[PDB]
Amino acid sequence: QFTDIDKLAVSTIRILAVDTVSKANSGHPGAPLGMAPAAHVLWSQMRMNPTNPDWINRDRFVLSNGHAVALLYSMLHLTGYDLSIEDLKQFRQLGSRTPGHPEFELPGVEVTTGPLGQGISNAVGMAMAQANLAATYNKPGFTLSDNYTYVFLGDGCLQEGISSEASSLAGHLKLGNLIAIYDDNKITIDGATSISFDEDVAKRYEAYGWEVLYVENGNEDLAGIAKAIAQAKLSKDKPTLIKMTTTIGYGSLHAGSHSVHGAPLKADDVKQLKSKFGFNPDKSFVVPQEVYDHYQKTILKPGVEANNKWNKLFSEYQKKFPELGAELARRLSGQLPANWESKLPTYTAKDSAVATRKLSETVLEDVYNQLPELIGGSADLTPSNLTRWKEALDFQPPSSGSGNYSGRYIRYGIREHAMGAIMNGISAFGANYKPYGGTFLNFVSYAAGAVRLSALSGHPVIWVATHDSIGVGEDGPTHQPIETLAHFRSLPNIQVWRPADGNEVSAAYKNSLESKHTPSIIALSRQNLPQLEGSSIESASKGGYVLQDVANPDIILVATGSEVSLSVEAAKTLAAKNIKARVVSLPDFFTFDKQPLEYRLSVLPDNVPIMSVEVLATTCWGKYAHQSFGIDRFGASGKAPEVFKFFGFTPEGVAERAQKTIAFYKGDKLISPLKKAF
Amino acid sequence: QFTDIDKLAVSTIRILAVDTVSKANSGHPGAPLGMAPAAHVLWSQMRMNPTNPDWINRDRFVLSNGHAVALLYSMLHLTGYDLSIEDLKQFRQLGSRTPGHPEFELPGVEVTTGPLGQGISNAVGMAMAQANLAATYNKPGFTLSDNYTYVFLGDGCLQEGISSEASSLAGHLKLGNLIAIYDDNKITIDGATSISFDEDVAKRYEAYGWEVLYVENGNEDLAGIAKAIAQAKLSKDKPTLIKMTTTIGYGSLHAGSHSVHGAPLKADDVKQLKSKFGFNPDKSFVVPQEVYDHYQKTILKPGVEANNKWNKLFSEYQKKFPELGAELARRLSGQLPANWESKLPTYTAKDSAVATRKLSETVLEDVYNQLPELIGGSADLTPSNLTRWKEALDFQPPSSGSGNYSGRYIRYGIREHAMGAIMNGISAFGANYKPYGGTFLNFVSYAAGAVRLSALSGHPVIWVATHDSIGVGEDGPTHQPIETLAHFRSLPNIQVWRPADGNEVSAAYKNSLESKHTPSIIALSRQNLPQLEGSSIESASKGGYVLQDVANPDIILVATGSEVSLSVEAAKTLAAKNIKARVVSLPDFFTFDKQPLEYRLSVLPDNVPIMSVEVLATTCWGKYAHQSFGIDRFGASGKAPEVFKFFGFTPEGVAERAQKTIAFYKGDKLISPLKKAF
Numbered sequence A, B: 001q002f003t004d005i006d007k008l009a010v011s012t013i014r015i016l017a018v019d020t021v022s023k024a025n026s027g028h029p030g031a032p033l034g035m036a037p038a039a040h041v042l043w044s045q046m047r048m049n050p051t052n053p054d055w056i057n058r059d060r061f062v063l064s065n066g067h068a069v070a071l072l073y074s075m076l077h078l079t080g081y082d083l084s085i086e087d088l089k090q091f092r093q094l095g096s097r098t099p100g101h102p103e104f105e106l107p108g109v110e111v112t113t114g115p116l117g118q119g120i121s122n123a124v125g126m127a128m129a130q131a132n133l134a135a136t137y138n139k140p141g142f143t144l145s146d147n148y149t150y151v152f153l154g155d156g157c158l159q160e161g162i163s164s165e166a167s168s169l170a171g172h173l174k175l176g177n178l179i180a181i182y183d184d185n186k187i188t189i190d191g192a193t194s195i196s197f198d199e200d201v202a203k204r205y206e207a208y209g210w211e212v213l214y215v216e217n218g219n220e221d222l223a224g225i226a227k228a229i230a231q232a233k234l235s236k237d238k239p240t241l242i243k244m245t246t247t248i249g250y251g252s253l254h255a256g257s258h259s260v261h262g263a264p265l266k267a268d269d270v271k272q273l274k275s276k277f278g279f280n281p282d283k284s285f286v287v288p289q290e291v292y293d294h295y296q297k298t299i300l301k302p303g304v305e306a307n308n309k310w311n312k313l314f315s316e317y318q319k320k321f322p323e324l325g326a327e328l329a330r331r332l333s334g335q336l337p338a339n340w341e342s343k344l345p346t347y348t349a350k351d352s353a354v355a356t357r358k359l360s361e362t363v364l365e366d367v368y369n370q371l372p373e374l375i376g377g378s379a380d381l382t383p384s385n386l387t388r389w390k391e392a393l394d395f396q397p398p399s400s401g402s403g404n405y406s407g408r409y410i411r412y413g414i415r416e417h418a419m420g421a422i423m424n425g426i427s428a429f430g431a432n433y434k435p436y437g438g439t440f441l442n443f444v445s446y447a448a449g450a451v452r453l454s455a456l457s458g459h460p461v462i463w464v465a466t467h468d469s470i471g472v473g474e475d476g477p478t479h480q481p482i483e484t485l486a487h488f489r490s491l492p493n494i495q496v497w498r499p500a501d502g503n504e505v506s507a508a509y510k511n512s513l514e515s516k517h518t519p520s521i522i523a524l525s526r527q528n529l530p531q532l533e534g535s536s537i538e539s540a541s542k543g544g545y546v547l548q549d550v551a552n553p554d555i556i557l558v559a560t561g562s563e564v565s566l567s568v569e570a571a572k573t574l575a576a577k578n579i580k581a582r583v584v585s586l587p588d589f590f591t592f593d594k595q596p597l598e599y600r601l602s603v604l605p606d607n608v609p610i611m612s613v614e615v616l617a618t619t620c621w622g623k624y625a626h627q628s629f630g631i632d633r634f635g636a637s638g639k640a641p642e643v644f645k646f647f648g649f650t651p652e653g654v655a656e657r658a659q660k661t662i663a664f665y666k667g668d669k670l671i672s673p674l675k676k677a678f
């Protein structure tokens, strides 16, 4: 029941957001000024503990419309999370804790948003991840997970294909604890939504399978909002959209203009707004004691009490259910099982040639039983990507009769970007979740918005990217990656592995699965590739290593994936004409650059021409080679062996070019490419 | 009204598709078999001339589910286009005219499809362009324009959010002539649709503003199919989606299973299919003469008359309306206006400091009314990308009162990937359309699926990618691009222009617009750059030029955009303590690479260290520079000066690295990065 202090709390939130922006002289005031009534009614009612932003059973909230940050920064400060008035007084300034869009890193900021469509897609991950933790561990008497996921989204989030892909998926999956409040404010940048966004959101979300509720006066009606969120929590097998109509800039002298969406309210306009709300036009960053006190009784102190009950419950759970207790206790400590690597496969030059894609399949068979925290799937290619383990159970709603919520094989359907960002949500949940998803390497580029965010945030999701090259063959150039790895090798903090054989696939799985902050893309072959006399998990784990050495080489050939194989074979050719080639396999530039310089330079030295072999774009190879053999044009639809021969990637074709590079450079001295001047 | 021959043509299409697949022993056979009735019936009521595939008013077909290409190659052959049973007999083989997914580059193939969600979004562009052409030239008694745009799509297209993003804008724009038939076959790759897709498409489509029609028996109801396409043609105010039901792999012994989705059928199964359809199990690629006669009759000879009357009409029109008849014939010969390039702004160092964002807005204003084919706009950032010319009318339905279809400024909404395939589709329409779309450089990455196909097909779309670097300032790392230009520089066939000043922007536009086959991306600034002494349209047009030159330079500083004036100041500091820099401005890697090597090696020779300055990834710059100063980590939220400074990009900070590159190399003989060994 909302009293006058509930109306004083909401004026302090709107004005503190307004002051935060206008101090920085940069920012978005409109959506924070309009959603403040909702942020109050929701947080007031959210089971959280601000002294411990990591409790696993915390109600999670994602502000999908990340430009409204001053609303999250104000909510976080007033409800006793770690953020201060000086932090807010340094909004959007260099080296502050308050950047212009929310970053995962910070406390009580659950994922990082600002790309539109990303937050609501992340909250689907979080609710899936919760459905599973609860099905796995919750025993009768010990309901350890049951948190809700509350999301704030705007018109930009609904316009973007990804929220639509995600919402189709949340709907099918019956994700009943996922409440989305849509700030239906009839404005975006260009102007009004009637100019470009005018479809029936409600009829669209109902088609998906979502329950849609409505709040006619979201600017003033705390009462309404409270009853909607309340009925929304009765939605046990439907996600809910609450279409809450508000006014952009509410209170501002230009409320409803498109002008209050992304620039600070002009001085006087903040003064009239302070007056109208009962605050002083000449004072800033003012918070009444009454507000601090209110959220202390309403949120801080009961959340702590809830956290503390959850802890006693988890210890009797541990006493009762000693091994489930154990397993969850570890996932929460964030440890991978003691010595899990001992179940990763190892091969010899003696074992059969198998496509790196089938070798990926075999790892996933040996680690699913070892890691209850590994949930993953495919975006409609389970057969093609060799991405499921034989003894799996799909993540599905119990009524489907074709899986249940404890399943760990997710079927994402043809939805790459959404797969990408749901993966970040599962990851951002906690309890050591290790998410992965399979697709064809070429279409990971459809997911680029979400993949950059796994890198910026530092979320360890794994992309199992199959069909990595022209070896795809007859599907032709719409489906042969040329630029994909180059691109992702310019992205900071992502590991773009490309395993060449058995042992290079297990090292690629062990560093990805051991990663705590870098995402990963493992590019895998369609075609059969042999096992190398020289590969080993141990060496490939370094990201680049000498596969075959010669004493005193004429050339060093660095190759990745299928080309390593071709290179060894080109090296027998050159050997026969008395050229001594050293062959270096570089499975990952990331991991490799993480090595100490002395190690790297022992692989790639001074005074030796270095020529690289990779069937994709030569442009990222300048940091390791002197000359590069690669494909800088699009592919061709033919039987794959003919496509490689057509492009020249043959033992003698590589060899011929190795010869031409030796000749080109005879008599010069050559600095290693790794060496830099500053 | 359909007859025994119409039931024999449908059989002939079914079995030719099956034979084109089994000969290749690579292919997806089921959607060809399933959809053959629908194909026969739609292609029969199409105004098209198989003899002149470029006829501007031909009803346009787009197979959005590209993987069903065996049905398309069967249709194109049988109706009299240039494709013989021989080209059909080398489907999917290295070098044939019959690749494994359609490519724009073929007669009767309108767009390259294969990546899901791409063809339907393309067809929305083709309908927007039709609507503009007709509203611009159609005068009474002279309907020069009135064609339908027909699209076939399947479940996978529907799950790709680009196709939702596009069906929303189409719903908005009321594109009544776009009719889309959907293969409700109830199979995709991972088995059944319900496994992960059971939303109500129809209800979703009505919410966009589409008319939905249903055909219960797609397998054999020729009359009902024909009914739904007549019915659909009536609604001028609604795009129409016909939901048709088919058995995937109809007629096969394994019809309805996901097995017939992507694999050639078993021989015993192809013999029983042929027998079942009255054809000889022991003969391949049979086209009964009555089918040939039938299509000659019902499609080719009509089509040739519609085309001919159309030309008589167009010459009366050029008698009747001189200017408009000459402009349309000029656009139809793909020639831009004579000396259109003269209206482009030139500047000098005495001119003012301007962000190249404003300068771009100005070129758009000065040439709009010279180039009637330029139609374009932003993705809800019209104010940020300054993407307007002000005497503009928006492209809208007349009934909006906001504009009408003669408008040439489109407001895409926050829909980047659909803007990507709609500009592709507008371009693919003809009449010399010059689309351009705008968004932030950073989020062109949402549109990468579309941007690669612009390049792979060679549709000349211009992206006006504003806000190129850490100069975006306070919005911080989620908006500041780090890897983007390196990604697009690794993709074959796209101009990535990053112009430094007024003249370099005119240069970008001149080149972009005269391009008939290569897309373009112009990365514009936020902050104000000044007018470089030494730039010119002419030099800037070569891709890279020497801005300042010295007799016997100690260093060459290569730079792009904002970094070229910095590098000119770094050179001013270096000279002061006598190190001579030649400063080379490199606004487009593509165009520069297209130059005669004698010109290129004159810009970057041997025996000088070359260091490159750009506030973005260093990974691309191996092909021009000996050392690169750049940013290989995400950005920062702060005021942009403070952020450039933080990163080190100050005159002195640059002078300093040049000094260190000179000392590092002093004494080695150097080679231009341009000289390649093979």
Ligand SMILES: Cc1nc(C)c(C[n+]2csc(CCOP(=O)(O)OP(=O)([O-])O)c2C)c(N)n1
Pocket (backbone or CB within 6 Å): A030, A031, A065, A067, A114, A115, A116, A117, A154, A155, A156, A157, A185, A187, A188, A189, A248, A261, B379, B380, B381, B414, B439, B440, B443, B446
């Ligand atoms: C993917 C994406 N694209 C774009 C291009 C933007 C730029 N952007 C920021 S706010 C916004 C639209 C804001 O509209 P809204 O969601 O309705 O927010 P409101 O109601 O104005 O607060 C745009 C286009 C973005 N942040 N992310």
Ligand SMILES: Cc1nc(C)c(C[n+]2csc(CCOP(=O)(O)OP(=O)([O-])O)c2C)c(N)n1
Pocket (backbone or CB within 6 Å): A379, A380, A381, A414, A439, A440, A443, A446, B030, B031, B065, B067, B068, B114, B115, B116, B117, B154, B155, B156, B157, B160, B183, B185, B187, B188, B189, B248, B261
């Ligand atoms: C963007 C994208 N992603 C993917 C991953 C694919 C791979 N692909 C090809 S066909 C298809 C399934 C298509 O199913 P459908 O459209 O229902 O086809 P149908 O009815 O069985 O002929 C998939 C996943 C693709 N071509 N494009």
Ligand SMILES: [Ca+2]
Pocket (backbone or CB within 6 Å): A154, A155, A156, A183, A184, A185, A186, A187, A188
């Ligand atoms: Ca809005």
Ligand SMILES: [Ca+2]
Pocket (backbone or CB within 6 Å): B154, B155, B156, B183, B185, B186, B187, B188, B248
């Ligand atoms: Ca299907």
